[PDB]
Amino acid sequence: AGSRARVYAEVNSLRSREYWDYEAHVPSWGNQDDYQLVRKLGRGKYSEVFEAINITNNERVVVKILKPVKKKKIKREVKILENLRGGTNIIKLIDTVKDPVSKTPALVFEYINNTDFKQLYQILTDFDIRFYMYELLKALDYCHSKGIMHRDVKPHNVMIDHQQKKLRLIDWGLAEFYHPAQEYNVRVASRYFKGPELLVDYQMYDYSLDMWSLGCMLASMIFRREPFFHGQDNYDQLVRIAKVLGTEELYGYLKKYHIDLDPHFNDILGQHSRKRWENFIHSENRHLVSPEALDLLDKLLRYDHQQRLTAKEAMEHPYFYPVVKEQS
Ligand SMILES: O=C(O)c1ccc2c(c1)nc(Nc1cccc(Cl)c1)c1ccncc12
Ligand SMILES: NCCc1ccc(Cl)c(Cl)c1
Numbered sequence: 001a002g003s004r005a006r007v008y009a010e011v012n013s014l015r016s017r018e019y020w021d022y023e024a025h026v027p028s029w030g031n032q033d034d035y036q037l038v039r040k041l042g043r044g045k046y047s048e049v050f051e052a053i054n055i056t057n058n059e060r061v062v063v064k065i066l067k068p069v070k071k072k073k074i075k076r077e078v079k080i081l082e083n084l085r086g087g088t089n090i091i092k093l094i095d096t097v098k099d100p101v102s103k104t105p106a107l108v109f110e111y112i113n114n115t116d117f118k119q120l121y122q123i124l125t126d127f128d129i130r131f132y133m134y135e136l137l138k139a140l141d142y143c144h145s146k147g148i149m150h151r152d153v154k155p156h157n158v159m160i161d162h163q164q165k166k167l168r169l170i171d172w173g174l175a176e177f178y179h180p181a182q183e184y185n186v187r188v189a190s191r192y193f194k195g196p197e198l199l200v201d202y203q204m205y206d207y208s209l210d211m212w213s214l215g216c217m218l219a220s221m222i223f224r225r226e227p228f229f230h231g232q233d234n235y236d237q238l239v240r241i242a243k244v245l246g247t248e249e250l251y252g253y254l255k256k257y258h259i260d261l262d263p264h265f266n267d268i269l270g271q272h273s274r275k276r277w278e279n280f281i282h283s284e285n286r287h288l289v290s291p292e293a294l295d296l297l298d299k300l301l302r303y304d305h306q307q308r309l310t311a312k313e314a315m316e317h318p319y320f321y322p323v324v325k326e327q328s
Pocket of ligand 2: 124
């Protein structure tokens with residue numbers, strides 16, 4: 001009874017229990033032998049990702065092989081992906097398969113030819129940033145409307161093919177279902193994308209965590225400082241935030257939600273004024289910054305998770321009017 005979402009708060013409560021009760025979900029496991037692995041793309045803590053071909057139809061896909069011990073978490077990710085089926089700009093789950101002998105499970109996703117913007121293709125224009133942020137917002141509004149927090153929004157999870165102008169939000173392995181008053185694990189998101197709520201151990205968070213992470217991505221893109229808040233550890237991460245947003249404002253947020261700060265922060269936070277967003281503008285980024293962009297960013301990167309724009313409210317912001325007009 002400390003906090004709840006401003007939007008879609010009851011939306012899982014209003015659905016059949018089977019929608020959100022992922023522990024009860026019984027996936028249909030197809031045959032992984034239909035997929036030929038071509039190339040290893042990477043590895044995470046509990047998964048590895050390969051480029052592959054479906055040999056029955058010659059389609060290129062990716063296969064994400066799951067360490068099989070984590071049964072509840074597998075069911076969670078599978079059920080979330082099935083619920084998100086057809087959602088705008090959400091990576092498409094094509095199948096759920098197992099090796100028919102070992103029974104190791106794997107997820108088959110559509111392939112996206114991800115651009116490395118760090119050199120190869122094109123450095124983003126103002127319009128490009130608006131466009132891709134708007135497309136990312138569609139995916140977040142969709143999943144939030146579906147009662148799902150992603151909880152790991154960061155650039156690596158936002159796959160963009162800059163030649164075809166396609167965007168997909170990937171890696172739903174940390175995603176959860178939002179339920180009013182539920183206390184969630186704060187050990188989610190990449191350090192640089194963690195909202196203050198996580199950093200101060202506030203467990204009654206909601207979809208608005210994803211809006212912090214998308215604000216961090218907006219800042220990094222318009223100002224060309226990636227990641228925007230570069231902490232060396234979780235404590236330093238909050239200090240990096242406070243050096244921008246201010247310490248008095250942090251204390252107001254803590255008092256509103258009755259939050260206790262870990263006392264180790266006493267030795268490191270200092271005293272910081274709230275900075276003007278215009279302080280980040282210089283010759284290398286001025287062509288990406290506008291009054292609109294700053295107004296939007298200022299409404300995303302707020303301590304108080306309840307005062308951040310929703311995905312929809314962000315979509316509706318003037319910053320995206322040029323994109324809306326072009327999509328007409
Ligand atoms: O987890 C998912 O939902 C997930 C879903 C789809 C992709 C993915 C992860 N990772 C990819 N690439 C990648 C690149 C570097 C490291 C790692 Cl582990 C993976 C990738 C590439 C091309 N098309 C789709 C994907
Ligand atoms: N992997 C691409 C991450 C990225 C880069 C630029 C933008 Cl504007 C966005 Cl939304 C996402």
